[PDB]
């Protein structure tokens, strides 16, 4: 996260860190959607141009963390993966359309003050909240500058109008993505970075006070987008795939 601020303790209890086992390295953010399911970006697990093709046994997750370095005794939890599911129509060569993956934990994680699932969006939430100008929130331990944070970082970012999204890049965008970020004009320039990829873009419903995961942080390299908005996988549009994987 660039130009964010320190998260408060328990502010993002669905935040998950994805690690490579050996050599040990932070790969991507992710999110807790139940006691044994984690949502992330497909490109976090499968990206052939960089010889990336992780299996379940290559990876681990850490849940309930606040500090990047410090071990948080009796608070943070580690889990192995039973199975990885990548969207069968994930397009890694062109535009990263359907950049979404699910990971099933080997054992269910115990919920706590620091570990709690985020809601999947329903139709009403998707229809009313996913509008240009409306702000969502990204959290992560990704890079800090165009270097690394001590505690979880948070930034709030406005959804960008679709024609602006299309004009911000040369690759063919689809309806399965949306873009968020501040205008190249004055104001702020908070953003998600590499490392924050795979993590949740969340919005709070004023109707019922709940947090909904509307997006998944898609591709990023460093903290430089050349002033362009970042892209997010549209979770609601891919909700039936998620349900098919989790149920039956």
């Amino acid at each position: 996260i660039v130009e964010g601020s320190d998260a408060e303790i328990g502010m993002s209890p669905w935040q998950v860190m994805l690690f490579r086992k050996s050599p040990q390295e932070l790969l991507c953010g992710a999110s807790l959607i139940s006691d044994r399911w984690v949502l992330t970006a497909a490109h976090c697990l499968l990206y052939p141009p960089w010889d990336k093709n992780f299996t379940e046994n290559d990876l681990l997750v850490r849940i309930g963390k606040h500090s990047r370095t410090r071990y948080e005794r009796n608070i943070e939890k580690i889990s192995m993966l039973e199975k990885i599911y990548i969207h069968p129509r994930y397009n890694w060569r062109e535009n990263l359309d359907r950049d979404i993956a699910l990971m099933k934990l080997k054992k269910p994680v115990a919920f706590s003050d620091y570990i709690h699932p985020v809601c999947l969006p329903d139709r009403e939430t998707a229809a009313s909240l996913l509008q240009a100008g409306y702000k969502g929130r990204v959290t992560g331990w990704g890079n800090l500058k165009e270097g690394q944070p001590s505690v979880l970082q948070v930034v709030n970012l406005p959804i960008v109008e679709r024609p602006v999204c299309k004009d911000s890049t040369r690759i063919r965008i689809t309806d399965n993505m949306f873009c968020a970020g501040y205008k190249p004009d004055e104001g702020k320039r908070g953003d998600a970075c590499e490392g924050d990829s795979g993590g949740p873009f969340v919005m709070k419903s004023p109707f019922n006070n709940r947090w909904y995961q509307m997006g998944i942080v898609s591709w990023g390299e460093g903290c430089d987008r050349d002033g362009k908005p970042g892209f997010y996988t549209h979770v609601f549009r891919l909700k039936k795939w998620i349900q098919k994987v989790i149920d039956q």
Binding site: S112, H116, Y134, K135, N156, P206
Partner: peptide
């Protein structure tokens, strides 16, 4: 039943430092 309600915030009737920014944006 319980998703998206944080134990240390919504469940305690406490608000985080920047959630106002999100809710005020919803025009």
């Amino acid at each position: 039943a319980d998703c998206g309600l944080r134990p240390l915030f919504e469940k305690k009737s406490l608000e985080d430092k920047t959630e106002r920014e999100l809710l005020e944006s919803y025009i």
